[PDB]
Amino acid sequence: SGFRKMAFPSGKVEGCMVQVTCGTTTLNGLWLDDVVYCPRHVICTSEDMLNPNYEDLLIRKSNHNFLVQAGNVQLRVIGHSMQNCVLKLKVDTANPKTPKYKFVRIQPGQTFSVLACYNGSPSGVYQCAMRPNFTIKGSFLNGSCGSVGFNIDYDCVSFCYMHHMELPTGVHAGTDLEGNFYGPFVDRQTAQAAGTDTTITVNVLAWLYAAVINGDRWFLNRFTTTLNDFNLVAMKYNYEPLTQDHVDILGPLSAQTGIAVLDMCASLKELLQNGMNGRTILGSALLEDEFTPFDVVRQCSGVTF
Amino acid sequence: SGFRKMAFPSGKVEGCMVQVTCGTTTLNGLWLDDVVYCPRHVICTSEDMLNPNYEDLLIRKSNHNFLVQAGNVQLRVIGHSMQNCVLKLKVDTANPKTPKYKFVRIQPGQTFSVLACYNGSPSGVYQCAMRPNFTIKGSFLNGSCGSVGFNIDYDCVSFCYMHHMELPTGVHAGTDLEGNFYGPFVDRQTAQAAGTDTTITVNVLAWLYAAVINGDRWFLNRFTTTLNDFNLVAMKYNYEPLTQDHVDILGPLSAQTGIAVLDMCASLKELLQNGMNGRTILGSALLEDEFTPFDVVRQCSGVTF
Ligand SMILES: C[C@H]1c2ccsc2CCN1C(=O)Cn1nnc2ccccc21
Ligand SMILES: C[C@H]1c2ccsc2CCN1C(=O)Cn1nnc2ccccc21
């Protein structure tokens, strides 16, 4: 027992990280098969950044301008293209360390692991959620651009995130591996509004189930609620609406604990209306929304890769 | 910016995990050079567990009784010895994936990453502290025994922890890699008192520095304190005493923020006496004690391996 914010083992991804240099800028790339993926803003200079013309900037570059280094080994670049906000550099060698992998665009509220890297070298790994407003609350310093987020299912790495920028508000934004931003963001240095964020209700409930499984049970109460009544409360507290699809995905946890989903909603209701009265749940004094129902079951059942 | 509970990249350790089976019990081993390390309780059965006679149990075992499997590859065991609470199985092949490594006994209050494994396969990675009472608050299910904790400095993995057991209170206990338990624990199924635990004061202060660096500054106040006055408060709130050695290690963070260590103590004092008044610091509604001063600087300066 016990419950922690657990990341995927990062080995399969560490083997894919490289450094990509263009002019004076260095950041991280992802080397899969014979293609290196990185943020297209590697080709910008400081003047370029307020409104880069990426098409014009890329035209002034040739294959030999992109320096790609994997540990000590230099890779030879034989083609380049821009897809959306990512650059794809074709190299002459397939990465021998390439895992089975897929590219996925995840949904808001889903979680993934981030391998933070600088100069193509891994620094640390942590678990994140894609916020409902399509930002992530990460830990990234300058030089972390091109760090990726991923999930692993058996032997298969599903890459879902590549880091591009920190917004002036101090949260993070980036793309899928086809170079499409999550959210309304663009790769230029402007103030950019991230929408209203909300709490991921289905995750909080998953985490409450996790707490019961681990024997934190003090917040269980004598009440129940309806989906409609609960959603009135959810809206007041800036929680995402709970749908029957959400209730359905919580089914396995409901079965395991014998606590019906709507009874657990009535617990959550009481916590939202009354707070925690200075108590803790799984070591936390607020309601945690960065564990999916899938995450709770995996951690509580101990799936490996 | 941003601040997360970040684990070391786990790749170097994943390459060292194996499954070790003796009779009906399977758990995890660590394969370094030509030696596999695992918890000695692999040789017990259910009857054995209340007070195993490990010497007598081991005498009934031969090299060929220890089945060691690394992925699909079976290893040949050519020697066995018990050191303290660990078994050391000599195998005929050096692990080709062995990193530069050291074995270290860490101090209470130090942090490390855990790679949770089942049947020799990695499941997840997370960051922990060794509690002042020499327990860890992990996430371990049955079959996780032999999972290890580690730190990495450049290319060198310092192994500090091997998981042995969950206590009836639901916290975790284990050994260094020489098989010496942290704390008073023994590898037999009895009720075992873990001492009074305290909060790791030097870590809380490191984390407050981290919050200032990231722009969470609301708890900074107009006050200062002395080491003696602060320690009166620390004792009332079951915090570890702060020593000048602690003040010294916080020096770099003090320099970076320009906030003297004792002024940050006066902030912490006010938080202990007044609570957080329903506010948060770095996304937390309690005082976090699982980041060392070294951790904060690394994360805030972005060191790689
Ligand atoms: C100005 C901004 C930007 C805006 C549009 S594209 C782009 C690339 C450069 N940039 C960054 O934010 C880079 N970056 N990413 N994560 C960071 C964490 C700490 C510091 C810098 C960081
Ligand atoms: C009975 C106890 C024990 C006590 C003395 S040696 C020993 C080995 C077996 N054991 C464990 O606790 C094993 N274990 N370790 N982490 C766990 C998490 C969830 C469930 C079982 C777990």
Side-chain angles (χ1 to χ4, degrees), chain A residues 1 4 7 10-11 14 121 123-125 137 139-140 166 172 290 299 303-304, chain B residues 1 4 7 10-11 14 121 123-125 137 139-140 166 172 290 299 303-304:
Chain A
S1 73
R4 279 284 184 171
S10 61
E14 290 165 51
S121 295
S123 168
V125 63
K137 300 189 178 234
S139 173
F140 292 107
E166 183 170 306
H172 299 114
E290 290 201 304
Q299 181 158 171
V303 166
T304 69
Chain B
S1 73
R4 279 284 184 171
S10 61
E14 290 165 51
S121 295
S123 168
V125 63
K137 300 189 178 234
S139 173
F140 292 107
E166 183 170 306
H172 299 114
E290 290 201 304
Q299 181 158 171
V303 166
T304 69

PDB file of all heavy atoms in Angstrom, chain A residues 1 4 7 10-11 14 121 123-125 137 139-140 166 172 290 299 303-304, chain B residues 1 4 7 10-11 14 121 123-125 137 139-140 166 172 290 299 303-304:
ATOM      1  N   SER A   1       0.828  -1.202   0.000  1.00  0.00           N
ATOM      2  CA  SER A   1       0.000   0.000   0.000  1.00  0.00           C
ATOM      3  C   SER A   1       0.869   1.261   0.000  1.00  0.00           C
ATOM      4  O   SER A   1       2.084   1.186  -0.194  1.00  0.00           O
ATOM      5  CB  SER A   1      -1.030  -0.058   1.123  1.00  0.00           C
ATOM      6  OG  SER A   1      -0.422   0.130   2.389  1.00  0.00           O
ATOM      7  N   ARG A   4       1.663   7.229  -4.363  1.00  0.00           N
ATOM      8  CA  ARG A   4       2.602   8.274  -4.711  1.00  0.00           C
ATOM      9  C   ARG A   4       2.334   8.776  -6.126  1.00  0.00           C
ATOM     10  O   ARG A   4       1.834   8.018  -6.923  1.00  0.00           O
ATOM     11  CB  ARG A   4       3.980   7.596  -4.773  1.00  0.00           C
ATOM     12  CG  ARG A   4       4.581   7.428  -3.386  1.00  0.00           C
ATOM     13  CD  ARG A   4       5.110   8.785  -2.930  1.00  0.00           C
ATOM     14  NE  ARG A   4       5.800   8.706  -1.643  1.00  0.00           N
ATOM     15  CZ  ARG A   4       6.486   9.720  -1.126  1.00  0.00           C
ATOM     16  NH1 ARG A   4       6.586  10.839  -1.823  1.00  0.00           N
ATOM     17  NH2 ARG A   4       7.034   9.635   0.080  1.00  0.00           N
ATOM     18  N   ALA A   7       5.903   8.220 -11.824  1.00  0.00           N
ATOM     19  CA  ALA A   7       6.159   8.399 -13.240  1.00  0.00           C
ATOM     20  C   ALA A   7       6.444   7.033 -13.854  1.00  0.00           C
ATOM     21  O   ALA A   7       6.720   6.059 -13.145  1.00  0.00           O
ATOM     22  CB  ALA A   7       7.372   9.273 -13.415  1.00  0.00           C
ATOM     23  N   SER A  10      11.732   5.701 -17.183  1.00  0.00           N
ATOM     24  CA  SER A  10      12.104   6.624 -18.253  1.00  0.00           C
ATOM     25  C   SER A  10      13.157   6.044 -19.202  1.00  0.00           C
ATOM     26  O   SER A  10      13.539   6.738 -20.134  1.00  0.00           O
ATOM     27  CB  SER A  10      12.589   7.923 -17.679  1.00  0.00           C
ATOM     28  OG  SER A  10      13.753   7.756 -16.847  1.00  0.00           O
ATOM     29  N   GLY A  11      13.655   4.816 -18.935  1.00  0.00           N
ATOM     30  CA  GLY A  11      14.765   4.265 -19.718  1.00  0.00           C
ATOM     31  C   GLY A  11      14.556   4.285 -21.243  1.00  0.00           C
ATOM     32  O   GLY A  11      15.470   4.650 -21.996  1.00  0.00           O
ATOM     33  N   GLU A  14      15.005   7.828 -22.422  1.00  0.00           N
ATOM     34  CA  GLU A  14      16.336   8.397 -22.290  1.00  0.00           C
ATOM     35  C   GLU A  14      17.182   8.034 -23.522  1.00  0.00           C
ATOM     36  O   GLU A  14      17.934   8.882 -24.011  1.00  0.00           O
ATOM     37  CB  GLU A  14      17.062   7.821 -21.061  1.00  0.00           C
ATOM     38  CG  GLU A  14      16.484   8.300 -19.716  1.00  0.00           C
ATOM     39  CD  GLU A  14      16.959   7.471 -18.521  1.00  0.00           C
ATOM     40  OE1 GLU A  14      18.172   7.282 -18.378  1.00  0.00           O
ATOM     41  OE2 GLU A  14      16.116   6.977 -17.784  1.00  0.00           O
ATOM     42  N   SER A 121      20.635  15.647 -22.426  1.00  0.00           N
ATOM     43  CA  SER A 121      20.878  14.773 -21.289  1.00  0.00           C
ATOM     44  C   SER A 121      19.733  14.847 -20.279  1.00  0.00           C
ATOM     45  O   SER A 121      19.329  15.920 -19.856  1.00  0.00           O
ATOM     46  CB  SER A 121      22.175  15.115 -20.623  1.00  0.00           C
ATOM     47  OG  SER A 121      23.246  14.842 -21.516  1.00  0.00           O
ATOM     48  N   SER A 123      17.559  14.955 -16.920  1.00  0.00           N
ATOM     49  CA  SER A 123      17.803  15.544 -15.611  1.00  0.00           C
ATOM     50  C   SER A 123      16.869  14.895 -14.578  1.00  0.00           C
ATOM     51  O   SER A 123      17.259  14.695 -13.436  1.00  0.00           O
ATOM     52  CB  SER A 123      17.630  17.053 -15.696  1.00  0.00           C
ATOM     53  OG  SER A 123      17.588  17.668 -14.424  1.00  0.00           O
ATOM     54  N   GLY A 124      15.605  14.651 -14.957  1.00  0.00           N
ATOM     55  CA  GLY A 124      14.638  14.136 -13.993  1.00  0.00           C
ATOM     56  C   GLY A 124      13.318  13.745 -14.658  1.00  0.00           C
ATOM     57  O   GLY A 124      13.084  14.072 -15.826  1.00  0.00           O
ATOM     58  N   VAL A 125      12.507  12.981 -13.914  1.00  0.00           N
ATOM     59  CA  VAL A 125      11.233  12.494 -14.429  1.00  0.00           C
ATOM     60  C   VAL A 125      10.132  12.767 -13.422  1.00  0.00           C
ATOM     61  O   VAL A 125      10.336  12.629 -12.210  1.00  0.00           O
ATOM     62  CB  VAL A 125      11.313  11.013 -14.835  1.00  0.00           C
ATOM     63  CG1 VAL A 125      11.620  10.103 -13.665  1.00  0.00           C
ATOM     64  CG2 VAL A 125      10.084  10.535 -15.617  1.00  0.00           C
ATOM     65  N   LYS A 137       1.464  22.131 -15.663  1.00  0.00           N
ATOM     66  CA  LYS A 137       2.197  22.720 -14.555  1.00  0.00           C
ATOM     67  C   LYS A 137       3.445  21.873 -14.305  1.00  0.00           C
ATOM     68  O   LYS A 137       3.474  21.000 -13.435  1.00  0.00           O
ATOM     69  CB  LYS A 137       1.237  22.808 -13.368  1.00  0.00           C
ATOM     70  CG  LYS A 137       0.005  23.665 -13.627  1.00  0.00           C
ATOM     71  CD  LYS A 137      -0.841  23.918 -12.381  1.00  0.00           C
ATOM     72  CE  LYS A 137      -2.032  24.816 -12.666  1.00  0.00           C
ATOM     73  NZ  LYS A 137      -2.048  25.976 -11.741  1.00  0.00           N
ATOM     74  N   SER A 139       8.035  21.530 -14.471  1.00  0.00           N
ATOM     75  CA  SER A 139       9.245  22.090 -13.906  1.00  0.00           C
ATOM     76  C   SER A 139      10.247  22.107 -15.050  1.00  0.00           C
ATOM     77  O   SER A 139      10.772  21.059 -15.431  1.00  0.00           O
ATOM     78  CB  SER A 139       9.722  21.222 -12.769  1.00  0.00           C
ATOM     79  OG  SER A 139      11.001  21.660 -12.300  1.00  0.00           O
ATOM     80  N   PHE A 140      10.444  23.290 -15.639  1.00  0.00           N
ATOM     81  CA  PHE A 140      11.242  23.420 -16.848  1.00  0.00           C
ATOM     82  C   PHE A 140      12.081  24.685 -16.699  1.00  0.00           C
ATOM     83  O   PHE A 140      11.548  25.725 -16.324  1.00  0.00           O
ATOM     84  CB  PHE A 140      10.352  23.595 -18.090  1.00  0.00           C
ATOM     85  CG  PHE A 140       9.527  22.407 -18.509  1.00  0.00           C
ATOM     86  CD1 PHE A 140       8.153  22.388 -18.301  1.00  0.00           C
ATOM     87  CD2 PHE A 140      10.112  21.312 -19.125  1.00  0.00           C
ATOM     88  CE1 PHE A 140       7.399  21.289 -18.706  1.00  0.00           C
ATOM     89  CE2 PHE A 140       9.354  20.200 -19.493  1.00  0.00           C
ATOM     90  CZ  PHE A 140       7.996  20.204 -19.295  1.00  0.00           C
ATOM     91  N   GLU A 166       7.401  28.510 -21.825  1.00  0.00           N
ATOM     92  CA  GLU A 166       6.766  28.928 -20.592  1.00  0.00           C
ATOM     93  C   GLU A 166       6.004  30.214 -20.868  1.00  0.00           C
ATOM     94  O   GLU A 166       6.549  31.170 -21.429  1.00  0.00           O
ATOM     95  CB  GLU A 166       7.810  29.036 -19.472  1.00  0.00           C
ATOM     96  CG  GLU A 166       7.202  29.413 -18.117  1.00  0.00           C
ATOM     97  CD  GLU A 166       8.133  29.320 -16.907  1.00  0.00           C
ATOM     98  OE1 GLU A 166       8.738  28.246 -16.675  1.00  0.00           O
ATOM     99  OE2 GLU A 166       8.213  30.307 -16.165  1.00  0.00           O
ATOM    100  N   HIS A 172       3.149  26.002 -18.545  1.00  0.00           N
ATOM    101  CA  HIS A 172       3.933  25.509 -19.661  1.00  0.00           C
ATOM    102  C   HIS A 172       3.000  25.115 -20.806  1.00  0.00           C
ATOM    103  O   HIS A 172       1.865  24.678 -20.586  1.00  0.00           O
ATOM    104  CB  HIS A 172       4.810  24.345 -19.170  1.00  0.00           C
ATOM    105  CG  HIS A 172       5.759  24.786 -18.104  1.00  0.00           C
ATOM    106  ND1 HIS A 172       5.672  24.333 -16.797  1.00  0.00           N
ATOM    107  CD2 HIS A 172       6.754  25.705 -18.132  1.00  0.00           C
ATOM    108  CE1 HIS A 172       6.614  24.900 -16.066  1.00  0.00           C
ATOM    109  NE2 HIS A 172       7.281  25.754 -16.858  1.00  0.00           N
ATOM    110  N   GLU A 290      -4.549  15.019 -10.260  1.00  0.00           N
ATOM    111  CA  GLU A 290      -3.595  14.552 -11.259  1.00  0.00           C
ATOM    112  C   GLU A 290      -3.405  13.032 -11.264  1.00  0.00           C
ATOM    113  O   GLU A 290      -2.389  12.554 -11.770  1.00  0.00           O
ATOM    114  CB  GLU A 290      -2.210  15.135 -10.972  1.00  0.00           C
ATOM    115  CG  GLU A 290      -2.133  16.610 -11.221  1.00  0.00           C
ATOM    116  CD  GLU A 290      -0.681  17.034 -11.417  1.00  0.00           C
ATOM    117  OE1 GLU A 290       0.179  16.762 -10.509  1.00  0.00           O
ATOM    118  OE2 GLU A 290      -0.407  17.590 -12.489  1.00  0.00           O
ATOM    119  N   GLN A 299      -1.549   1.622 -10.248  1.00  0.00           N
ATOM    120  CA  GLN A 299      -0.716   1.742  -9.061  1.00  0.00           C
ATOM    121  C   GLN A 299      -1.197   0.762  -7.997  1.00  0.00           C
ATOM    122  O   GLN A 299      -0.375   0.144  -7.320  1.00  0.00           O
ATOM    123  CB  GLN A 299      -0.664   3.167  -8.509  1.00  0.00           C
ATOM    124  CG  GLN A 299       0.226   3.328  -7.272  1.00  0.00           C
ATOM    125  CD  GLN A 299       0.721   4.726  -6.986  1.00  0.00           C
ATOM    126  OE1 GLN A 299       1.296   4.983  -5.926  1.00  0.00           O
ATOM    127  NE2 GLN A 299       0.484   5.663  -7.902  1.00  0.00           N
ATOM    128  N   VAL A 303       0.939  -2.928 -12.441  1.00  0.00           N
ATOM    129  CA  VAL A 303       1.250  -3.254 -13.833  1.00  0.00           C
ATOM    130  C   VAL A 303       2.680  -2.787 -14.169  1.00  0.00           C
ATOM    131  O   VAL A 303       3.096  -1.716 -13.722  1.00  0.00           O
ATOM    132  CB  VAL A 303       0.166  -2.659 -14.767  1.00  0.00           C
ATOM    133  CG1 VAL A 303       0.549  -2.641 -16.247  1.00  0.00           C
ATOM    134  CG2 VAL A 303      -1.189  -3.337 -14.572  1.00  0.00           C
ATOM    135  N   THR A 304       3.423  -3.610 -14.941  1.00  0.00           N
ATOM    136  CA  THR A 304       4.807  -3.369 -15.365  1.00  0.00           C
ATOM    137  C   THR A 304       4.902  -3.303 -16.898  1.00  0.00           C
ATOM    138  O   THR A 304       3.910  -3.518 -17.611  1.00  0.00           O
ATOM    139  CB  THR A 304       5.810  -4.357 -14.731  1.00  0.00           C
ATOM    140  OG1 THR A 304       5.655  -5.696 -15.216  1.00  0.00           O
ATOM    141  CG2 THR A 304       5.756  -4.396 -13.222  1.00  0.00           C
TER     142      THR A 304
ATOM    143  N   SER B   1      10.689  27.706 -14.820  1.00  0.00           N
ATOM    144  CA  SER B   1      10.232  27.652 -13.435  1.00  0.00           C
ATOM    145  C   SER B   1       9.189  26.547 -13.247  1.00  0.00           C
ATOM    146  O   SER B   1       8.982  25.721 -14.138  1.00  0.00           O
ATOM    147  CB  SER B   1       9.784  29.032 -12.964  1.00  0.00           C
ATOM    148  OG  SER B   1       8.550  29.402 -13.558  1.00  0.00           O
ATOM    149  N   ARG B   4       8.505  20.481  -9.002  1.00  0.00           N
ATOM    150  CA  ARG B   4       7.823  19.206  -8.931  1.00  0.00           C
ATOM    151  C   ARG B   4       8.637  18.216  -8.105  1.00  0.00           C
ATOM    152  O   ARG B   4       9.837  18.348  -8.062  1.00  0.00           O
ATOM    153  CB  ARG B   4       7.831  18.646 -10.362  1.00  0.00           C
ATOM    154  CG  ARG B   4       6.728  19.263 -11.208  1.00  0.00           C
ATOM    155  CD  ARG B   4       5.404  18.615 -10.809  1.00  0.00           C
ATOM    156  NE  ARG B   4       4.291  19.072 -11.640  1.00  0.00           N
ATOM    157  CZ  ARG B   4       3.080  18.528 -11.591  1.00  0.00           C
ATOM    158  NH1 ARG B   4       2.879  17.499 -10.785  1.00  0.00           N
ATOM    159  NH2 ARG B   4       2.075  19.021 -12.304  1.00  0.00           N
ATOM    160  N   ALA B   7      11.965  12.609  -9.838  1.00  0.00           N
ATOM    161  CA  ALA B   7      12.805  11.451  -9.603  1.00  0.00           C
ATOM    162  C   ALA B   7      13.984  11.509 -10.567  1.00  0.00           C
ATOM    163  O   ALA B   7      13.967  12.251 -11.555  1.00  0.00           O
ATOM    164  CB  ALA B   7      12.011  10.203  -9.880  1.00  0.00           C
ATOM    165  N   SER B  10      15.499   6.762 -14.568  1.00  0.00           N
ATOM    166  CA  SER B  10      15.600   5.417 -14.008  1.00  0.00           C
ATOM    167  C   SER B  10      16.300   4.430 -14.947  1.00  0.00           C
ATOM    168  O   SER B  10      16.435   3.274 -14.573  1.00  0.00           O
ATOM    169  CB  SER B  10      14.240   4.899 -13.640  1.00  0.00           C
ATOM    170  OG  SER B  10      13.358   4.815 -14.775  1.00  0.00           O
ATOM    171  N   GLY B  11      16.685   4.869 -16.167  1.00  0.00           N
ATOM    172  CA  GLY B  11      17.228   3.943 -17.165  1.00  0.00           C
ATOM    173  C   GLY B  11      18.395   3.068 -16.672  1.00  0.00           C
ATOM    174  O   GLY B  11      18.426   1.858 -16.938  1.00  0.00           O
ATOM    175  N   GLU B  14      16.968   0.398 -14.439  1.00  0.00           N
ATOM    176  CA  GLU B  14      16.097  -0.582 -15.066  1.00  0.00           C
ATOM    177  C   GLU B  14      16.939  -1.727 -15.654  1.00  0.00           C
ATOM    178  O   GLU B  14      16.539  -2.890 -15.544  1.00  0.00           O
ATOM    179  CB  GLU B  14      15.314   0.045 -16.234  1.00  0.00           C
ATOM    180  CG  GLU B  14      14.233   1.048 -15.792  1.00  0.00           C
ATOM    181  CD  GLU B  14      13.709   1.921 -16.934  1.00  0.00           C
ATOM    182  OE1 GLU B  14      13.326   1.369 -17.972  1.00  0.00           O
ATOM    183  OE2 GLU B  14      13.745   3.137 -16.801  1.00  0.00           O
ATOM    184  N   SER B 121      10.424  -6.604 -13.451  1.00  0.00           N
ATOM    185  CA  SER B 121      10.045  -5.609 -14.441  1.00  0.00           C
ATOM    186  C   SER B 121       9.636  -4.294 -13.777  1.00  0.00           C
ATOM    187  O   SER B 121       8.811  -4.270 -12.875  1.00  0.00           O
ATOM    188  CB  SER B 121       8.934  -6.116 -15.306  1.00  0.00           C
ATOM    189  OG  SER B 121       9.401  -7.218 -16.071  1.00  0.00           O
ATOM    190  N   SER B 123       7.830  -0.845 -12.847  1.00  0.00           N
ATOM    191  CA  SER B 123       6.442  -0.413 -12.923  1.00  0.00           C
ATOM    192  C   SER B 123       6.384   1.123 -12.887  1.00  0.00           C
ATOM    193  O   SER B 123       5.547   1.722 -13.548  1.00  0.00           O
ATOM    194  CB  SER B 123       5.648  -1.058 -11.797  1.00  0.00           C
ATOM    195  OG  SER B 123       4.364  -0.488 -11.639  1.00  0.00           O
ATOM    196  N   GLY B 124       7.217   1.751 -12.045  1.00  0.00           N
ATOM    197  CA  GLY B 124       7.140   3.200 -11.883  1.00  0.00           C
ATOM    198  C   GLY B 124       8.289   3.744 -11.033  1.00  0.00           C
ATOM    199  O   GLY B 124       9.017   2.975 -10.398  1.00  0.00           O
ATOM    200  N   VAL B 125       8.471   5.070 -11.099  1.00  0.00           N
ATOM    201  CA  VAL B 125       9.553   5.729 -10.378  1.00  0.00           C
ATOM    202  C   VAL B 125       9.012   6.923  -9.615  1.00  0.00           C
ATOM    203  O   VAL B 125       8.147   7.651 -10.115  1.00  0.00           O
ATOM    204  CB  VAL B 125      10.717   6.098 -11.313  1.00  0.00           C
ATOM    205  CG1 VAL B 125      10.314   7.092 -12.380  1.00  0.00           C
ATOM    206  CG2 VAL B 125      11.973   6.551 -10.560  1.00  0.00           C
ATOM    207  N   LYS B 137       7.800   6.387   3.272  1.00  0.00           N
ATOM    208  CA  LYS B 137       6.399   6.394   2.883  1.00  0.00           C
ATOM    209  C   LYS B 137       6.325   6.193   1.369  1.00  0.00           C
ATOM    210  O   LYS B 137       6.208   7.144   0.593  1.00  0.00           O
ATOM    211  CB  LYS B 137       5.793   7.705   3.384  1.00  0.00           C
ATOM    212  CG  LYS B 137       5.863   7.886   4.894  1.00  0.00           C
ATOM    213  CD  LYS B 137       5.078   9.092   5.407  1.00  0.00           C
ATOM    214  CE  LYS B 137       5.129   9.212   6.919  1.00  0.00           C
ATOM    215  NZ  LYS B 137       3.760   9.288   7.487  1.00  0.00           N
ATOM    216  N   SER B 139       5.164   3.472  -2.161  1.00  0.00           N
ATOM    217  CA  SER B 139       4.022   2.850  -2.799  1.00  0.00           C
ATOM    218  C   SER B 139       4.520   1.493  -3.272  1.00  0.00           C
ATOM    219  O   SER B 139       5.261   1.411  -4.253  1.00  0.00           O
ATOM    220  CB  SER B 139       3.564   3.701  -3.956  1.00  0.00           C
ATOM    221  OG  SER B 139       2.543   3.033  -4.703  1.00  0.00           O
ATOM    222  N   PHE B 140       4.171   0.446  -2.518  1.00  0.00           N
ATOM    223  CA  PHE B 140       4.714  -0.882  -2.754  1.00  0.00           C
ATOM    224  C   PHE B 140       3.569  -1.875  -2.574  1.00  0.00           C
ATOM    225  O   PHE B 140       2.841  -1.787  -1.590  1.00  0.00           O
ATOM    226  CB  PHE B 140       5.801  -1.233  -1.725  1.00  0.00           C
ATOM    227  CG  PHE B 140       7.091  -0.461  -1.806  1.00  0.00           C
ATOM    228  CD1 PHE B 140       7.396   0.513  -0.863  1.00  0.00           C
ATOM    229  CD2 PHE B 140       8.012  -0.711  -2.813  1.00  0.00           C
ATOM    230  CE1 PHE B 140       8.600   1.211  -0.942  1.00  0.00           C
ATOM    231  CE2 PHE B 140       9.197   0.020  -2.905  1.00  0.00           C
ATOM    232  CZ  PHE B 140       9.490   0.967  -1.956  1.00  0.00           C
ATOM    233  N   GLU B 166       6.510  -4.145   4.427  1.00  0.00           N
ATOM    234  CA  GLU B 166       5.566  -3.151   4.895  1.00  0.00           C
ATOM    235  C   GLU B 166       5.237  -3.464   6.347  1.00  0.00           C
ATOM    236  O   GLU B 166       4.892  -4.598   6.692  1.00  0.00           O
ATOM    237  CB  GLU B 166       4.346  -3.103   3.964  1.00  0.00           C
ATOM    238  CG  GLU B 166       3.329  -2.028   4.360  1.00  0.00           C
ATOM    239  CD  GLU B 166       2.203  -1.760   3.361  1.00  0.00           C
ATOM    240  OE1 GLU B 166       2.486  -1.479   2.172  1.00  0.00           O
ATOM    241  OE2 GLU B 166       1.040  -1.780   3.786  1.00  0.00           O
ATOM    242  N   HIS B 172       7.015   1.712   5.184  1.00  0.00           N
ATOM    243  CA  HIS B 172       7.871   0.739   4.533  1.00  0.00           C
ATOM    244  C   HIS B 172       9.245   0.739   5.203  1.00  0.00           C
ATOM    245  O   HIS B 172       9.716   1.768   5.697  1.00  0.00           O
ATOM    246  CB  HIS B 172       7.932   1.065   3.031  1.00  0.00           C
ATOM    247  CG  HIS B 172       6.582   0.982   2.397  1.00  0.00           C
ATOM    248  ND1 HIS B 172       5.931   2.093   1.885  1.00  0.00           N
ATOM    249  CD2 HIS B 172       5.724  -0.060   2.277  1.00  0.00           C
ATOM    250  CE1 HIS B 172       4.752   1.740   1.411  1.00  0.00           C
ATOM    251  NE2 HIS B 172       4.596   0.428   1.651  1.00  0.00           N
ATOM    252  N   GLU B 290      10.108  16.808   1.860  1.00  0.00           N
ATOM    253  CA  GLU B 290      10.809  15.797   1.077  1.00  0.00           C
ATOM    254  C   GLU B 290      11.669  16.379  -0.049  1.00  0.00           C
ATOM    255  O   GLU B 290      11.997  15.656  -0.992  1.00  0.00           O
ATOM    256  CB  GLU B 290       9.799  14.879   0.385  1.00  0.00           C
ATOM    257  CG  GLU B 290       9.064  13.991   1.343  1.00  0.00           C
ATOM    258  CD  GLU B 290       8.481  12.792   0.603  1.00  0.00           C
ATOM    259  OE1 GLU B 290       7.705  12.988  -0.395  1.00  0.00           O
ATOM    260  OE2 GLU B 290       8.837  11.673   0.996  1.00  0.00           O
ATOM    261  N   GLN B 299      17.217  21.173  -9.044  1.00  0.00           N
ATOM    262  CA  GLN B 299      16.010  21.388  -9.828  1.00  0.00           C
ATOM    263  C   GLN B 299      15.983  22.821 -10.344  1.00  0.00           C
ATOM    264  O   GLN B 299      15.596  23.049 -11.491  1.00  0.00           O
ATOM    265  CB  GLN B 299      14.731  21.059  -9.058  1.00  0.00           C
ATOM    266  CG  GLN B 299      13.445  21.252  -9.868  1.00  0.00           C
ATOM    267  CD  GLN B 299      12.231  20.495  -9.380  1.00  0.00           C
ATOM    268  OE1 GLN B 299      11.119  20.720  -9.860  1.00  0.00           O
ATOM    269  NE2 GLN B 299      12.410  19.611  -8.401  1.00  0.00           N
ATOM    270  N   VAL B 303      20.755  20.339 -13.344  1.00  0.00           N
ATOM    271  CA  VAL B 303      21.864  19.395 -13.483  1.00  0.00           C
ATOM    272  C   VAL B 303      21.364  18.098 -14.148  1.00  0.00           C
ATOM    273  O   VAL B 303      20.256  17.645 -13.851  1.00  0.00           O
ATOM    274  CB  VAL B 303      22.537  19.168 -12.105  1.00  0.00           C
ATOM    275  CG1 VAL B 303      23.479  17.966 -12.054  1.00  0.00           C
ATOM    276  CG2 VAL B 303      23.243  20.426 -11.602  1.00  0.00           C
ATOM    277  N   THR B 304      22.182  17.526 -15.058  1.00  0.00           N
ATOM    278  CA  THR B 304      21.897  16.304 -15.818  1.00  0.00           C
ATOM    279  C   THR B 304      22.942  15.218 -15.514  1.00  0.00           C
ATOM    280  O   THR B 304      23.913  15.453 -14.778  1.00  0.00           O
ATOM    281  CB  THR B 304      21.706  16.566 -17.328  1.00  0.00           C
ATOM    282  OG1 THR B 304      22.918  16.960 -17.982  1.00  0.00           O
ATOM    283  CG2 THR B 304      20.649  17.598 -17.639  1.00  0.00           C
TER     284      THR B 304
END
